[PDB]
């Protein structure tokens, strides 16, 4: 009976924390071994009274007690374990308090309604009235969970408790109360919320602390979503409207982030009435944070607008502000915009986009900043399907060559991914006139991602423009690229052969590609030496058994002879894959 | 046996390419195998060119993935990462697992040096131990990787000209024979030739001087020049000091400071660099900035 406690005390009082953590983990086994009556009588008071200077053990026991209910004996005896939980609630560390409150949530959920009313509700009033703001913050979260099972009188009592604690002078608890407000309205009724919460809510909004007003706007959107449309205009629109023009930019930043939820909840008519002017006001705020945050939501705000006046408002107010935002010199706002501006390409339509958007998109692309360029070029695809190939291809043709070579490699990759569409649109002649040079230059770019993407794109080009075209133009050069002192380009040739041999038929590969690849097997560089075997593995299925068994087999068996273990392993692997021996 | 194990390792490689750490038993089997594969390399594990030298990583997995995107996939482009790839990163366990997995899969397509941060003491108080405890719960993997960290080589020699080592030179050491005679099966002592090799650095001073790091020393232009003359070396490559261009020359083209962990601690915002030597010892340089997340 007391021997378990005697071992527990010595185990828990030591130097390290690992043994204490193991003791906490084994607490459940100890309790179940001793018995329900033993634990309830002796073990629980000991853990209630013990105080530790270290916090991981506290956190572990906090999370353990939640599962410890079944060992305690089920919901009938959770009143026994409520005292330790409430005593643990009042602590100086926030994470342990968070674990305490979630454990209380679980305990309340499993608690029977009658016992909950009898005991837990008396506990929460004490926890809230505790002089310590830690106690008050731990209390504030229990109101939402405890509301349903209690009677109407208890509901009123806890509602006025919530109002009183929200009326506290210090922000440190008011922020927590405001955060729990949104959840609390989930269980309340329309009459109760409109009667009590909305007034205290406007009081919180009028409060001076931008910190509390940040959670106030969140509770605003939550309660607006909860309530029907016909009543929000009565009370909440003035509050959010005046908050949107608060001196502090933090609340204006938060409401910019949450703007889409507000318009979605209120509905398109309300947005057309009064939200859009406020959104415009955000467009022209000296603070860059709010400007960028609002710019990030333009696509989703627009798409949530009915077609009745969507395009009308877009031309009349949206696009005029968008052009000014683009004209803004700040880097971050412009970069954020560049990602979303392509969002409303299908919304405006073919005519409107080419009329207005394309001049602005071209200006964004022709910008010094790397961030804006890499963002904008990323979303080039979206305009492709709304605007036919030829229009935007001709529009971008002047800037492709300069863009085809620039500092960042991500944009180069973006271009090399989209070029084959331009090649198909503009035909063989123009591509051979200028684009062929760009492709060939890319085939030897410093970075490796480029090289690989360029080879992949060249795969598309050969099949688009015919096998004979490649045999005429591309093969003599790429295949000639297998002689420079560097080995990187001699690897690039092998990748290109691995790719082209797929599309270039068999005769051309046999009389052009094979001879070179086979002659390269003796290269002193081990890397290329085994990557040649890797290429042969892929290319073997495309030959005829005669050519394979004639020339490939000697080279592959020769590769096995050499001394490098890795190339020898690839040689064996390819030999067995092709089943040549 | 070996064949099936190779295919199994391939699955681990591809999985780690997906940021998914292996099981504890897999980690145990990996460390056990890596002991036998690193025992056979002396202190100056010579590596033949070509090569792609990579500086400090500090376990930033997104950065390492972009570095692979830039240089090339490990089976193709040979690499020589230099140390400090376990600390000050939110994915350090994944990074180190990937590095050791590549090393075990390929004996000679890669080689990893030992940085100052790969020891028992430093990792405990700089996150890696905490990361391991949080992820795997216990410390079995921690006592596996810390045990492995001793078997790493100390320096690398590229075609008898380039000398790659994490920290730098040391007043006690003078010649490659001394490095070869040094014993590595020992947690980095707090003072000694092995200690300093992992805490040395350049400076425009001359002579010597106590390092502000509290360990190792700080060498001057003339010291590096004299050491290079002593042993015919033509360029020393180290990576312990954060930089901006990513690669910086010092001591009149004698020591190259490399750093391949862009935006150190997510806030420095520094670019990162990678050096690469072709077959004819034709050095180049590449630069990058971390991939979008």
């Amino acid at each position: 009976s007391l021997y378990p406690i005697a071992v527990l005390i010595d185990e828990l009082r030591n130097e390290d924390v690992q043994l204490r953590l193991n003791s906490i983990k084994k607490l459940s086994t100890i309790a179940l071994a001793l018995g329900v009556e033993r634990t309830r009588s002796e073990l629980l008071p000991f853990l209630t009274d013990t105080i530790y200077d270290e916090d991981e053990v506290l956190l572990a026991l906090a999370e353990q007690l939640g599962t410890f209910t079944t060992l305690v004996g089920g919901p009938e005896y959770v009143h026994c374990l409520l005292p330790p939980l409430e005593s643990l609630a009042t602590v100086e560390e926030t994470v342990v308090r968070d674990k305490a409150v979630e454990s209380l949530r679980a305990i309340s959920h499993e608690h029977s309604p009658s016992d909950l009313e009898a005991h837990f509700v008396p506990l929460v009033k004490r926890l809230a009235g505790g002089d310590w703001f830690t106690s008050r913050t731990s209390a504030c979260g229990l109101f939402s969970v405890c509301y349903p099972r209690v009677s109407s009188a208890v509901k009123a009592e806890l509602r006025q408790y919530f109002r009183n604690l929200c009326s506290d002078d210090t922000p440190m608890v008011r922020r927590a109360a405001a955060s729990k407000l949104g959840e609390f309205a989930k269980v309340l009724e329309l009459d109760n919320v409109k009667s009590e919460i909305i007034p205290m809510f406007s009081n919180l909004a009028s409060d001076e602390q931008d910190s509390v007003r940040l959670l106030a706007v969140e509770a605003c959107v939550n309660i607006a979503q909860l309530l029907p449309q016909e009543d929000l205009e009565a009370l909440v629109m003035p509050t959010l409207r005046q908050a949107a023009e608060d001196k502090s930019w933090r609340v204006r930043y938060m409401v910019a982030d949450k703007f889409t939820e507000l318009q979605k909840a209120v509905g398109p008519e309300i947005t057309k009435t009064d939200l859009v002017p406020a959104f415009q006001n955000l467009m022209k705020d000296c603070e860059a944070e709010v400007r960028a945050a609002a710019s990030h939501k333009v696509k989703e705000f627009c798409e949530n607008l009915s077609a009745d006046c969507r395009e009308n408002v877009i031309m009349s107010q949206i696009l005029p502000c968008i052009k000014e935002l683009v004209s803004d010199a700040n880097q971050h706002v412009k970069s954020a915009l560049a990602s979303v501006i392509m969002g409303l390409s299908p919304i405006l339509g073919k005519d409107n986009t080419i009329e207005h958007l394309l001049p602005l998109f071209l200006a964004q692309l022709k910008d010094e900043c790397p961030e804006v360029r890499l963002n904008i070029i990323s979303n080039l695809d979206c305009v492709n399907e709304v605007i036919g190939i030829r229009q935007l291809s001709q529009s971008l043709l002047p800037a492709i060559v300069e863009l085809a070579e620039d500092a960042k490699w991500r944009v180069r990759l973006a271009i090399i991914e989209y070029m084959p569409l331009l090649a198909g649109q503009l035909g063989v002649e123009f591509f051979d006139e200028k684009l062929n040079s760009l492709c060939m230059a890319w085939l030897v770019d410093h970075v490796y991602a480029i090289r690989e993407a360029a080879t992949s794109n060249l795969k598309k080009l050969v099949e688009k423009f015919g096998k004979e075209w490649a045999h005429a133009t591309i093969i003599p050069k790429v295949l000639a690229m297998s002689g420079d002192p560097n080995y990187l380009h001699r690897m690039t040739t092998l990748f290109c052969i691995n790719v082209l041999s797929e599309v270039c038929g068999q005769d051309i590969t046999t009389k052009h590609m094979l001879p070179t690849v086979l002659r390269m097997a003796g290269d002193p560089v081990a890397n290329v030496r085994f990557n040649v075997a890797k290429s042969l593995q892929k290319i073997g299925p495309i030959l005829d058994n005669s050519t394979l068994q004639s020339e490939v087999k000697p080279i592959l068996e020769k590769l096995t002879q050499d001394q490098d273990v890795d190339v020898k392993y690839f040689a064996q692997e390819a030999l067995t894959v092709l089943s040549l021996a | 046996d070996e064949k099936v194990f190779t295919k199994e390792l391939d699955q681990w490689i591809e999985q780690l390419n997906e940021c998914k750490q292996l099981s504890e038993s897999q980690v145990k089997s990996l460390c056990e195998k890596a002991k036998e594969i690193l025992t056979k390399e002396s202190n100056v594990q010579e590596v033949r060119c070509p090569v792609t030298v990579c500086g400090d990583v500090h376990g930033q997995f997104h950065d390492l993935m972009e570095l692979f995107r830039i240089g090339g996939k490990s089976p193709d482009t040979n690499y020589l990462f230099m140390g400090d790839y376990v600390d000050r990163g939110y994915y350090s366990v994944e990074t180190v697992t990937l590095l050791v997995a590549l090393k075990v899969r390929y004996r000679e397509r890669i080689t990893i040096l030992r940085g100052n941060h790969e020891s028992r003491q430093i990792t405990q108080v700089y996150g890696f131990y905490d990361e391991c405890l949080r992820k795997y719960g216990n410390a079995n993997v921690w006592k596996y990787f810390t045990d492995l960290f001793d078997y790493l080589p100390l320096t690398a020699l590229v075609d008898g000209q380039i000398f790659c080592l994490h920290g730098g030179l040391s007043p006690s050491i003078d010649t490659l024979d001394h490095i070869r005679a040094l014993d590595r099966l020992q947690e980095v002592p707090h003072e000694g030739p092995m200690c300093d090799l992992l805490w040395s650095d350049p400076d425009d001073r001359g002579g010597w001087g106590i390092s502000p790091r509290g360990a190792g020393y700080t060498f001057g232009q003339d010291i590096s020049e004299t050491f290079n003359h002593a042993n015919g070396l033509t360029l020393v490559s180290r990576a312990h000091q954060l930089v901006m261009e990513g690669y910086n020359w010092c001591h009149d083209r004698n020591v190259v400071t490399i750093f391949s962990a862009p935006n150190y601690c997510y806030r420095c915002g520094n670019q990162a660099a990678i050096m690469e030597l072709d077959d004819t010892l034709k050095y180049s340089f590449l630069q990058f900035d971390p991939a979008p997340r």
């Binding site: 944070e289 971050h332 | 520094n270």
Partner: peptide
């Protein structure tokens, strides 16, 4: 380097 670089990002 940071002082050279602009960074107006604020919560």
């Amino acid at each position: 380097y940071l002082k050279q670089v602009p960074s107006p990002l604020r919560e």
